[PDB]
Design an enzyme around this catalytic site. Structure first.
Site, PDB file in Angstrom:
ATOM      1  N   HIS A 284       0.825  -1.201   0.000  1.00  0.00           N
ATOM      2  CA  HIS A 284       0.000   0.000   0.000  1.00  0.00           C
ATOM      3  C   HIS A 284       0.863   1.256   0.000  1.00  0.00           C
ATOM      4  CE1 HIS A 284      -3.159  -2.896   1.024  1.00  0.00           C
ATOM      5  NE2 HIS A 284      -2.443  -3.251   2.074  1.00  0.00           N
TER       6      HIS A 284
ATOM      7  N   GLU B 210       3.923  -6.497   2.422  1.00  0.00           N
ATOM      8  CA  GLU B 210       3.292  -5.326   3.030  1.00  0.00           C
ATOM      9  C   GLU B 210       4.346  -4.423   3.700  1.00  0.00           C
ATOM     10  OE1 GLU B 210       1.631  -3.944   6.358  1.00  0.00           O
ATOM     11  OE2 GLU B 210       1.488  -2.483   4.709  1.00  0.00           O
TER      12      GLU B 210
HETATM   13  O1  LIG Z   1      -1.411   1.922   7.893  1.00  0.00           O
HETATM   14  C1  LIG Z   1      -0.399   1.271   8.279  1.00  0.00           C
HETATM   15  O2  LIG Z   1       0.627   1.890   8.661  1.00  0.00           O
HETATM   16  C2  LIG Z   1      -0.422  -0.223   8.289  1.00  0.00           C
HETATM   17  C3  LIG Z   1      -1.043  -0.936   7.126  1.00  0.00           C
HETATM   18  O3  LIG Z   1      -0.331  -0.687   5.967  1.00  0.00           O
HETATM   19  C4  LIG Z   1      -1.120  -2.407   7.399  1.00  0.00           C
HETATM   20  C5  LIG Z   1      -1.795  -3.318   6.412  1.00  0.00           C
HETATM   21  O4  LIG Z   1      -2.407  -2.883   5.436  1.00  0.00           O
HETATM   22  C6  LIG Z   1      -1.721  -4.795   6.615  1.00  0.00           C
HETATM   23  O5  LIG Z   1      -1.366  -5.269   7.735  1.00  0.00           O
HETATM   24  O6  LIG Z   1      -2.008  -5.565   5.657  1.00  0.00           O
HETATM   25  C7  LIG Z   1      -2.439  -0.446   6.985  1.00  0.00           C
HETATM   26  O7  LIG Z   1      -2.798   0.152   5.938  1.00  0.00           O
HETATM   27  O8  LIG Z   1      -3.259  -0.629   7.921  1.00  0.00           O
HETATM   28 ZN   LIG Z   2      -2.530  -4.675   3.785  1.00  0.00          ZN
END
Ligand SMILES: O=C(O)C[C@@](O)(CC(=O)C(=O)O)C(=O)O
Ligand SMILES: [Zn+2]
Ligand SMILES: O=C(O)C[C@@](O)(CC(=O)C(=O)O)C(=O)O
Ligand SMILES: [Zn+2]
Lengths: 334, 338
Positions: free
Chosen positions: A9, A277
Site C-alpha cells: 500500500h 506489506e
Molecule cells: O497503515 C499502516 O501503517 C499499516 C497498514 O499498511 C497495514 C496493512 O495494510 C496490513 O497489515 O495488511 C495499513 O494500511 O493498515
Molecule cells: Zn494490507
C-alpha cells in the site's frame, strides 16, 4: 524468475492527501493538487528503495488500507475518497510503470450495496489499467455487521470481478471499535472469519473462476489447518482442497521464519503468493535476527524447496491469480 | 498428564430440555419451570461413555472441566436468565467432580450478560471457588455474542472481577460462547478471533502492572498469535511497548488445542515452554478422525509426544505449568501426596 510482491500500500503520502481527508470528514461532521515530484519523492525514499535493497522486481500496489475507513462515512463520502486514493495509485504506476501495478480500494460504506463499487472497479480496471481490488468484508469498521461473503448481497459484485477477470484481496480497514486494534487484531480476525464464512457455504460452485486473496498468511487458518479440515467433516462439507483451494490464496506476510515454515508445510504450493506489506504494519528491525520483520523474501529464501516451488511462489501463482498482469508482462515479452 | 481445557458437552437430556423451556418462558414473560431431577448415574453414564472412555484410551490423568461453552449463550438474554443458567451449569460440573473427583477438577462459567456489570459473576466465582471448590473460571470477553461490543480486558469495567480472581488465586480462560452473528461461526471463527483479539488488547495496555499475579489462558494455542509471533513482537516496538516476554508472558499462557502436528510444531518452537499448557478440548469442536493420520484431530497428546523435547519440557507441558497457573489444584494434588 521475477519477484512480484502481491501485497503493498502507498503508505507514506503527500501531506495534502490526508489533510483533505480530515476536512472532508469535518465538512461532513458539520481536493489538493499534488505534483509528480512529490509522489516521486514519497516513493523513491521508501518503497522504491526497499524493492532495490531486497531484490524485488514488482509490487502489486494499493491505497493505505487503514485509511480507507469506509465507516466514516456514507456513499457521498466514500466515493470521492476512493476515487482520489485510487487516482494516486494510478499516478504512482504512471511514474514507475515497470515497478508498480495497480489494485483499487472500493467506495464501500456501511449502508450501501455494491453499485458504486462496481463502478469504481470498472473505472480502475477499464480506464486506469488496474489488475485487482481490495474487498472489505466489514465496512462498519470493527463489529462484523455485514453479511458473510457467501451472501448474495455480494453477488452482483463478483459477477463484475468475473467479467473483468480480476481477483480480490479480503481486507478490512481502520477500527472504530475500542476493543479491537486494527493491524494486530481486526486484520487477522477478518482473515480467519472470511475463510470460515466460505467454508460454511459453497460460493465457488456458483462462481468457479472467482478468486480471493486472504492476507497475512490467511490469518489463523494455516496454524489451525487441522481444526479447519476437521470442521469440514463436522459440517458435512466437502474437503478444503475442492471446496476452497482452487479459489482461495494466501500471501506470505507472516513476519518470522517459523510462521513461514508452517505456511509452506501445510498449504499447497499453488496457493502461496509472495507478499511483504512493506512500510506498513511492522516497520522496524527484528531484535532476534538483525533483519527487518517485513523483509519476507528472506524467509522464503531460507526454505528448502525446489526452483519450481520458489518460482510459483515468487512469480507464477501471482500471474495466475492476476490474469491482467500476466498479459501485461507477456506483452513486454517477459 | 493434566488436560487444562475440557467441557461437559454430552449431557443428560433433561438439562438441555430445561434450557429450552427456560428461554421459551422468558420470551413469553412467564416463570421458568422447575429444574429437573438428574440422577447420579445419569451423569455417570454420560461421563463414562465419552470423556472417561477417552481419557483412558489416551492415557491422560485428569481434566479441568467446565460447562459446554457454546451453550453458555450469555446473549440469551438478561441476568434473570443468565444467573439461573450459570448456577445450573456449574452445579453439574460440581456433581461430575463429586462422582469422579480423581479425574475432573471444576472450572466455572460466569453469569455474564450484555446489560450487566460483573457483580453477579464475582458472586458465582465466589460460590463455586469457596463453596464448591472450583479452581478457575471461563471469562467471556464478548457476552454480546459476535460483534465484540464490550470493553477490552484492559478496561476498568473488569477490574473488580480481577480483584476477586487475585484474592482467590484463580486463573481465567478467556472464552466466548455461541455466535448470534451470521457473519461469524462460533468454533471456527469467533473463538479464534476472540483469542487473537484478547492478546492484542493486552499488548496495547499494561494490565499486569496493575495486577502482577493475574493469570489468563488464551485457548486454542493462542489463536493466531504464535503463528504471527513476529508480527506481535514487531507490533510491540511499533507501539513503543515493552517486550512480550516481560509485558505479557509471565501472566499469559496458551493451551495445546491445536489439531495437527505442524501447528504444535510451531507452538513449541516459538513459545517459551513455561507458557504452554497441555489441553485437548476432547468431545468438542472437532470430534472426528484425521484422514491424513488415522488418529483423532483432538488427541493432542500424540502431537506433544512426537516433540523432540526433554523430559523436563514434557513435564512442564503435561503437569508443571498447569499446577502453577492453578495453585489450588496444585495444593489439592500435594495434599494427596502427589
Ligand atoms: O497503515 C499502516 O501503517 C499499516 C497498514 O499498511 C497495514 C496493512 O495494510 C496490513 O497489515 O495488511 C495499513 O494500511 O493498515
Ligand atoms: Zn494490507
Ligand atoms: O459446543 C461444542 O460442543 C464445542 C465446544 O466444545 C468447543 C470449544 O469449547 C472449544 O473449541 O474451545 C464448545 O463447548 O463450545
Ligand atoms: Zn473451549
Amino acid at each position: 524468475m521475477m519477484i512480484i510482491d502481491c501485497h503493498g500500500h502507498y503508505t507514506v503520502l503527500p501531506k495534502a492527501h490526508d489533510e483533505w481527508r480530515e476536512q472532508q470528514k469535518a465538512a461532513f461532521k458539520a481536493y489538493p493538487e499534488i505534483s509528480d515530484d512529490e509522489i516521486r519523492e514519497t516513493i523513491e525514499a521508501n518503497q522504491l528503495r526497499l524493492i532495490k535493497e531486497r531484490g524485488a522486481d514488482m509490487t502489486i500496489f494499493s491505497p493505505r488500507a487503514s485509511a480507507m475507513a469506509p465507516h466514516v462515512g456514507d456513499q457521498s463520502v466514500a466515493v470521492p475518497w476512493a476515487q482520489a486514493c485510487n487516482n494516486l495509485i494510478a499516478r504512482v504506476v504512471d511514474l514507475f510503470p515497470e515497478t508498480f501495478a495497480g489494485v483499487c480500494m472500493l467506495p464501500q460504506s456501511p449502508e450501501a450495496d455494491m453499485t458504486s463499487s462496481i463502478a469504481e472497479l470498472e473505472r480502475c480496471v477499464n480506464e486506469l489499467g488496474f489488475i485487482g481490488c481490495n474487498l472489505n468484508p466489514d465496512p462498519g469498521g470493527g463489529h462484523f455487521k455485514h453479511p458473510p461473503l457467501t451472501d448474495r448481497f455480494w453477488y452482483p459484485f463478483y459477477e463484475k470481478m468475473v467479467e473483468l477477470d480480476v481477483p480480490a484481496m479480503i481486507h478490512v480497514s481502520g477500527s472504530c471499535n475500542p476493543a479491537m486494534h486494527a493491524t494486530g487484531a481486526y486484520y487477522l480476525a477478518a482473515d480467519t472469519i472470511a475463510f470460515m464464512q466460505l467454508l460454511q457455504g459453497n460460493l465457488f460452485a456458483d462462481f468457479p473462476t472467482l478468486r480471493f486473496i486472504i492476507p497475512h498468511g490467511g490469518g489463523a487458518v494455516p496454524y489451525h489447518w487441522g481444526r479447519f479440515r476437521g470442521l469440514a467433516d463436522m459440517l458435512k462439507q466437502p474437503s478444503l482442497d475442492t471446496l476452497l483451494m482452487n479459489n482461495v490464496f494466501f500471501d506470505t506476510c507472516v513476519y518470522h521464519q517459523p510462521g513461514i515454515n508452517l505456511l509452506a508445510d501445510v498449504i499447497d504450493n499453488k496457493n502461496i503468493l509472495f507478499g511483504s506489506e512493506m512500510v506498513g504494519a511492522v516497520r522496524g528491525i527484528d531484535p532476534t535476527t538483525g533483519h527487518y520483520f517485513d523483509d519476507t523474501k528472506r524467509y522464503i529464501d531460507a526454505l528448502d524447496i525446489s526452483d519450481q516451488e520458489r518460482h510459483a511462489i515468487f512469480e507464477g501463482n501471482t500471474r495466475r491469480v492476476f490474469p491482467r498482469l500476466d498479459a501485461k508482462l507477456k506483452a513486454r515479452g517477459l
